[PDB]
Design a protein around this ligand. Structure first.
Ligand SMILES: Nc1nc(Nc2ccc(S(N)(=O)=O)cc2)nn1C(=O)c1c(F)cccc1F
Ligand SMILES: O=C(O)c1cc(-c2cccc(Br)c2)nc2ccccc12
Length: 257
């Protein structure tokens, strides 16, 4: 079905994290795509073979314009190869480094595209558990695409910044975990840093478990209301995705087709 001889490999798009992503082209069709090349050595040492197979299994079945497509996979005696959609405008992470912070318009748009992808995800019982700017890509029209379904699973670690209390405490969690992540993102998009950031993991753990965030002066009340409602300790007290898409701050600042 698939072999390395089928593609022409090009420029690096990112680095592992175990393995790199390279720009590539399929020889037969001239189809431009991105090839993630993971090493079996590193994958064994971390014990993630079951998790990656699980990721590929989940990600290959999903179809949404705000979820990055996986077209297929293959492997060699030494490496596993993933055939991904190439997002031409890069990471939201790099966008945010360039502008420092986003305006309400861009943020509300990104949150709408994000909630939509999550409604679709939850409607197949899949919970991402890992939304963060480095895992969000931008298509050719500047539309947001979710990328790394590695730590995803059916409902109901590096930096803790995006994880909710119930997760960092090891408590049972379900779909409402992604609602927290949205609030963290909405905060970081407007402020330029996540709300429980810190110089140490131990402090970030304290900050999250206690829900210790303050808003800078430029954050408007509509944004302060949506963020505050999302950043609740109690998962059942977080709103639904419907409620988020219909929030007055969102509806007054987002975009549509
Ligand atoms: N699938 C995919 N497409 C892209 N497009 C891309 C990425 C970076 C740039 S650039 N020159 O650094 O600004 C330009 C285009 N990245 N990508 C990935 O899987 C990917 C990822 F998810 C995280 C990190 C790196 C990646 F490569
Ligand atoms: O040597 C193998 O047979 C092997 C295969 C794979 C593999 C094969 C196909 C798809 C995916 Br995802 C992963 N992952 C590994 C991950 C670690 C070690 C070995 C492997």
């Amino acid at each position: 079905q698939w072999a390395l001889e089928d593609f022409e490999i090009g420029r690096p798009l990112g680095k592992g994290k175990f393995g790199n992503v390279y720009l590539a082209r399929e020889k037969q069709s001239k189809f431009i795509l991105a090839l993630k090349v993971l090493f079996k050595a590193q994958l064994e040492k971390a014990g993630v073979e079951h998790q990656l197979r699980r990721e590929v299994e989940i990600q290959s079945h999903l179809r949404h314009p705000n979820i990055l497509r996986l077209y297929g996979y293959f492997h060699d005696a030494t490496r596993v190869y993933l055939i991904l959609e190439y997002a031409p405008l890069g990471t939201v992470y790099r966008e945010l480094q360039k502008l420092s912070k986003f305006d309400e318009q861009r943020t509300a748009t990104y949150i709408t595209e994000l909630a939509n992808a999550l409604s679709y995800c939850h409607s197949k019982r899949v919970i991402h558990r890992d939304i963060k700017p480095e895992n969000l890509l931008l298509g050719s029209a500047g539309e947001l695409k979710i990328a790394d379904f590695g730590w995803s699973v059916h409902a109901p670690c590096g930096t803790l910044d995006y994880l909710p209390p119930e997760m960092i405490e090891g408590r049972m969690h379900d779909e409402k975990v992604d609602l927290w992540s949205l609030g963290v993102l909405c905060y970081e998009f407007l402020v330029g840093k996540p709300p429980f950031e810190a110089n140490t993991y131990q402090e970030t753990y304290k900050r999250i478990s206690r829900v210790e965030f303050t808003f800078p002066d430029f954050v408007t009340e509509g944004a302060r209301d949506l963020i505050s409602r999302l950043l609740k300790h109690n998962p059942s007290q977080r709103p639904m995705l419907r409620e988020v898409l219909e929030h007055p701050w969102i509806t007054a600042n987002s975009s549509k087709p």
